[PDB]
């Protein structure tokens, strides 16, 4: 006759242990949300004041700040790992650059400041459009793939905590709420997961950053609005995975201004921060689209690529999502870490003279060719 009651805190008491059981009850409810939509609805139905995160930012060590909130380790370089007349692409790309810059006739922008930014967008879009067509015969997957043009990626997660120092809720512990909304210049979405760049649970000596000051101390402002986690398309869209993301940096964050501002070293940080923010935010949404959340962390790593260009230089980034658990409860027991591999920005061509572009660098084009040709195994 062993009927002893469990030694647990009373749910109805006004104590930390009692509140913890009440807190655990809600966490248990999220475990019991069967459908993806129900999981998302429960997490995002309440609006609370939360930090607004800009994927592209000029903050010092911005890549480090984002990694600390995300638990992403950024290893320098590319992740460990059909001929199409690579020379032909250069000629085709050379025509595309000359097409927009020297051949197309369009109404001049009124502002006179968006002219430089507008031109960079046009050439990048054309190269992408022609590249998809030229690569289509070699890789039928691209034919079934979904290419997204300037559609938004959303993600919402909690990292860190703080105690209210004043007000009607003085002393209450409040988690730091964050949100990244990003609109990559272009991104490729596929219905099949990409080949993983490294086995799950991979551990490396490089360590996640930790931030000395609060997110508020650095410019980052908490606002109450809808919580959104989005892959660039609805759950109804068949393409719940994707291959590569394309980013175009604005003029303010471009290399020339940053060097003038003396933040030359942060040019890569701006590249790193945008890539880590976009890929993690985008990759995490797919796993949520697969039903995985913090307490139901992914059983298979989520991997993808991203490319960020400043108009002239081009950088290539690879991200693998191993952990969906950044909440203290779910992160309490997790040895996994998110791993990001990024390459430094490199020029794609030298100059445009007459009707012939000079100094085109195939090496950057080769990475694009490698990315376009890669397909799930």
């Amino acid at each position: 006759v062993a009927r002893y009651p469990p030694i647990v805190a009373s749910m109805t008491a006004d104590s930390k242990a009692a509140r913890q059981r009440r807190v655990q009850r809600w966490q248990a409810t999220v475990h019991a949300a069967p459908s993806v939509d129900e999981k998302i609805r429960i997490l995002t139905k309440m609006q609370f004041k939360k930090y607004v995160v800009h994927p592209q930012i000029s903050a010092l060590n911005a890549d480090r700040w984002y990694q600390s909130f995300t638990k992403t380790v950024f290893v320098s370089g590319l992740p460990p790992a059909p001929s199409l007349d690579l020379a032909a692409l250069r000629a085709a790309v050379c025509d595309c650059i000359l097409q927009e810059q020297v051949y197309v006739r369009r109404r001049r922008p009124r502002s006179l400041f968006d002219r430089r930014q507008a031109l960079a967008s046009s050439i990048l879009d054309q190269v992408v459009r022609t590249l998809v067509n030229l690569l289509a015969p070699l890789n039928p997957v691209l034919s079934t793939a979904a290419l997204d043009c300037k559609r938004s990626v959303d993600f919402y997660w909690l990292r860190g905590e703080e105690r209210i120092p004043a007000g009607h809720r003085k002393g209450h512990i409040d988690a730091l709420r964050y949100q990244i909304n990003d609109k990559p210049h272009n991104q490729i979405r596929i219905s099949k997961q990409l080949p993983e760049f490294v086995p799950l649970d991979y551990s490396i000596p490089t360590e996640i950053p930790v931030m000395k000051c609060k997110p508020d101390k650095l410019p980052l402002f908490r606002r109450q609005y809808e919580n959104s986690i989005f892959t660039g398309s609805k759950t109804a869209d068949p393409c719940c995975y994707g291959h590569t993301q394309f980013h175009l940096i604005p003029d303010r964050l471009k290399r020339e201004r940053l060097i003038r501002q003396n933040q030359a070293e942060q040019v890569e940080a701006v590249f790193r921060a945008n890539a880590i923010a976009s890929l993690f935010a985008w990759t995490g949404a797919q796993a949520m689209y697969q039903g995985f959340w913090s307490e139901a962390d992914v059983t298979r790593p989520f991997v993808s690529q991203a490319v960020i260009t400043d108009g002239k230089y081009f950088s290539f980034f690879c991200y693998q999502l191993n952990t969906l658990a950044l909440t203290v409860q779910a992160d309490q027991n997790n040895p996994r870490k998110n791993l990001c591999w990024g390459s430094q920005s490199q020029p794609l061509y030298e100059t445009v003279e007459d009707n012939d572009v000079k100094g085109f660098d195939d090496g950057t084009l080769l990475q694009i060719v490698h990315f376009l040709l890669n397909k799930p195994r």
Binding site: Q261, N262, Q263, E265
Partner: peptide
Amino acid sequence: LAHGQTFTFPDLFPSDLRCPGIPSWFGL
């Protein structure tokens, strides 16, 4: 600060008890 410079604020401003009521002056 730029150039990788860092700043830290300097540490500025681093009668006898047996005979009471008779002043000790008195020898009387």
